């Protein structure tokens, strides 16, 4: 019977506690976008786990794209090699998750009008400002975008379990306004 949220993207920030000569490491890496006049950091990458990585000279790096806390951590270890083998104190440390976005499909259109104007405390629909109808949970701090088709987007979770938690609490509400 199961409907459960999938993780679409995890944006993590980890710091290779050591100074990094961005010009150099861009050179060696070769296929790393490093460019003057704009953004001073090297944009690395990998085929799989297919993740993009913004390396900063402040020893810190922001890896994006991973569809799971473990893959991120894995892609977070790959990067401290390509910039370690190149004789560096690439000390992987203080790995943190900056945001987790999910998505889910309940497979039944929703009566958003009714949801919004009985839950206006949290729900939001200004046509010029944005398309669709929103919902802002206070606990846990999550912003869910709900569409008529029944597809919802869960954003702002700093931890995995909050996506399931957020959906586990809004599902009965959506079933109440299921358009038949």
């Amino acid at each position: 019977s199961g409907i459960v949220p999938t993780l679409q993207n995890i944006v993590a920030t980890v710091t290779l506690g050591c100074r990094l000569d961005l010009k150099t490491v861009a050179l060696h890496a070769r296929n790393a976008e490093y460019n003057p006049k704009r953004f001073a950091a090297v944009i690395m990458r990998i085929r799989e786990p297919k993740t993009t990585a913004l390396i900063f000279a402040s020893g810190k790096m922001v890896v994006t794209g991973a569809k799971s806390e473990d893959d991120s951590k894995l892609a977070s270890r790959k990067y401290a090699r390509i910039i370690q083998k190149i004789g560096f104190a690439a000390k992987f440390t203080d790995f943190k998750i900056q945001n987790i976005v999910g998505s889910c499909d309940v497979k039944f259109p929703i009566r958003l009008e009714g949801l919004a104007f009985s839950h206006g405390t949290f729900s939001s629909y200004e046509p010029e400002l944005f398309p669709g109808l929103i919902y802002r949970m206070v606990k846990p701090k999550i912003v869910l975008l709900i569409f008529v088709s029944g597809k919802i987007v869960l954003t702002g979770a700093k931890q995995r379990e909050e996506i399931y938690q957020a959906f586990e609490a809004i599902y009965p509400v959506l079933s109440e306004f299921r358009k038949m």
Binding site: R111, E113, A116, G120, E126, P127, F130, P131, V148
Partner: protein, 209 residues
């Protein structure tokens, strides 16, 4: 003004003939050209040709700011809640049509023709960005929604066997006179706190919304 007719439907009401929509088109065009006149003059008085968002939000400089900020970031209240709660409904794609108007504003993509139909000979040495195009979309949409509200308000304030050819599905709410009275009402002059020079003589001033 097909978008305006859709926007007029989004506010509350249906069935404007071509007259009211062309009139509203003229209204919005005039408002917007005046906005860009003022903002360009102020920037060039600061000494720059490029048109920017900081001037324009302060050009509104009123509770007109909270809603505009939300529109950019994405890129009383009980009444607007209660009316929407009354709207709650479905079938023949009830909620579906509501969305159309929201994502068919000029800023959605058709930024080019929206830029060209309005005035563009101004500032020939420069050219604004698409961020302000989206901004103007927001302002035009809000103006159309407000005008419609006042028109409906004045309309309400005014207060055998069937021959089967009358369809009993046709209504005639909105016309020139209603919108004209509403646009008089909205030009409430200033809050009147800006016309306090009570005992004098002579006057002139332009105005927006």
């Amino acid at each position: 003004m097909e978008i305006q007719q859709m926007m007029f439907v989004s506010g509350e009401t249906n069935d404007p003939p071509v007259e009211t929509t062309s009139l509203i088109e003229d209204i919005v065009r005039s408002q917007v050209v005046e906005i860009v006149l003022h903002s360009s003059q102020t920037a060039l008085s600061r000494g720059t040709k490029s048109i920017v968002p900081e001037d324009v939000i302060f050009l509104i400089r009123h509770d007109k700011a909270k809603v505009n900020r939300l529109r950019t970031y994405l890129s009383s209240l009980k009444r607007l809640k209660t009316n929407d709660e009354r709207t709650k409904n479905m079938t023949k794609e009830e909620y579906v049509h509501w969305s159309e108007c929201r994502q068919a504003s000029f800023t959605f993509r058709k930024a080019k023709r929206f830029r060209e139909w309005c005035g563009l000979s101004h500032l020939a040495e420069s050219r604004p960005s698409d961020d302000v195009i989206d901004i103007l979309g927001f302002l035009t949409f809000e103006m159309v929604c407000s005008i419609t509200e006042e028109a409906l308000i004045v309309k309400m304030l005014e207060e055998r066997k069937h021959l089967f050819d009358g369809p009993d599905k046709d209504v005639r709410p909105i016309t020139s006179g209603h919108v004209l009275e509403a646009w008089r009402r909205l030009q409430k002059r200033n809050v009147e706190k800006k016309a306090i020079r009570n005992f004098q003589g002579g006057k002139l001033r332009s105005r927006v919304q």
